[PDB]
Design a protein around this nucleic acid. Structure first.
Ligand SMILES: Nc1nc2c(ncn2[C@@H]2O[C@H](COP(=O)(O)CP(=O)(O)OP(=O)(O)O)[C@@H](O)[C@H]2O)c(=O)[nH]1
Ligand SMILES: [Mn+2]
Ligand SMILES: [Mn+2]
Ligand code: NA
Ligand code: NA
Length: 320
DNA sequence: CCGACCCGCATCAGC
DNA sequence: GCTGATGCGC
DNA sequence: GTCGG
């Protein structure tokens, strides 16, 4: 329930705009409309009712109308049956395959995972890993496994250097009972926004997590951001846990609070807070907040919320 | 009538 | 080789 | 696609 038909249609339309039309602002417009419609405490019986809502215009009104009177949207019906368009859309579910790679693959007749499999030579490293773990990466992670994951990360990080500080953020820090991946924020006293008194600070941590076979694969790795794969250890004759996505971001120790707000999310929440900062006359990123002027000061997450006239919403409530 | 719409890394284009 | 641009995911 | 200068 919950304007579910309209919200589902709009998200499907959003996905088509992103993956097939390569029209990112349309995708976002559909997502915004869907999220405002999902917040509406009433059942929409007309396109104009919907139109009174912020982010809903004439075209979405037109769609709600057809959908209400027919239970269907001809455009989506046609799109769903379209071999080329459905395949391009499907292939973007592989991590590392975006709209462009998906269209190039479908162009050459590569439309399915099996096509991908027998065409390894045509995949970059990221894409080969997205394909190897396609099922796993769409699996959800129970909070119980999350905590076993946090134990390992925190254990191994302090084993490299007791001065490190690791914080699991993302849906985890927001109390989610399941997560899509693990987001880890890392700080060390050597790395500060003013000087980098030690090198390899992120590398040593990844290496350690690799040595104890927690991290199994690398999708991207630079001085400040790791994107990869990890896996909880198993017991004797026990079904192996799924492989899971893990991201690690090394933030300067003096911008930890901007980091936590950033990596805690959500993504729709973030761009709803970022889109609010600009109208209060502020800029928000994972490092600072600025009027852009010098770095406005911070030592708490509520400090950011007051700046833009926002009442503190707890991590659990940032699930927008 | 039309422009705006919230950064790190891998790979590509090109000099 | 190198810079700069683009794709991708965040 | 939607909003607003
Ligand atoms: N300013 C932005 N921040 C983002 C964006 N996407 C993610 N994030 C921030 O990083 C945090 C982690 O992003 P993820 O892609 O892993 C999604 P999240 O952790 O919120 O939930 P899961 O599905 O359980 O992984 C997210 O909460 C926030 C974005 O597009 N823009
Ligand atoms: Mn996450
Ligand atoms: Mn993540
Ligand atoms: Na409206
Ligand atoms: Na993808």
């Amino acid at each position: 329930t919950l304007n579910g038909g309209i919200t589902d249609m709009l998200t499907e339309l959003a996905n088509f705009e992103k993956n097939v039309s390569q029209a990112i602002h349309k995708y976002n417009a559909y997502r915004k409309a869907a999220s405002v419609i999902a917040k509406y405490p009433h059942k929409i019986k007309s396109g104009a009712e919907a139109k009174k809502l912020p982010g809903v215009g004439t075209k979405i009104a037109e769609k709600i109308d057809e959908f209400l009177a027919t239970g269907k949207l001809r455009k989506l019906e046609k799109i769903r049956q379209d071999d080329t368009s459905s395949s391009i859309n499907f292939l973007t579910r592989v991590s590392g395959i975006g709209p462009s790679a998906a269209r190039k693959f479908v162009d050459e007749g590569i439309k399915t995972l099996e096509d991908l499999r027998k065409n390894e030579d045509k995949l970059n490293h990221h894409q080969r890993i997205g394909l190897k773990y396609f099922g796993d990466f769409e699996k959800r992670i129970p909070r119980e496994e999350m905590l076993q994951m946090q134990d390992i990360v925190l254990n191994e990080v302090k084993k490299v250097d007791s001065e490190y500080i690791a914080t699991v953020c993302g849906s985890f820090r927001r109390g989610a009972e399941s997560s899509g991946d693990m987001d880890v924020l890392l700080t060390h006293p050597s790395f500060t926004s003013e000087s980098t008194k030690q090198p390899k600070l992120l590398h040593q941590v990844v290496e350690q997590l690799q040595k104890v076979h927690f991290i199994t694969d690398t999708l991207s790795k630079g001085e400040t951001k790791f994107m990869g794969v990890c896996q909880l250890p198993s017991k004797n004759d026990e079904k192996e846990y799924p492989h899971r996505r893990i991201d690690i971001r090394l933030i300067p120790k003096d911008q930890y609070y901007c980091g936590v707000l950033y990596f805690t999310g959500s993504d729709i929440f973030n761009k709803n807070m970022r889109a609010h900062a600009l109208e209060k006359g502020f800029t928000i990123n994972e490092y600072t907040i600025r009027p852009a002027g010098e770095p406005l000061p911070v030592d708490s997450e509520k400090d950011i919320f007051d700046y833009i006239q926002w009442k503190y919403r707890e991590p659990k409530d940032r699930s927008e």
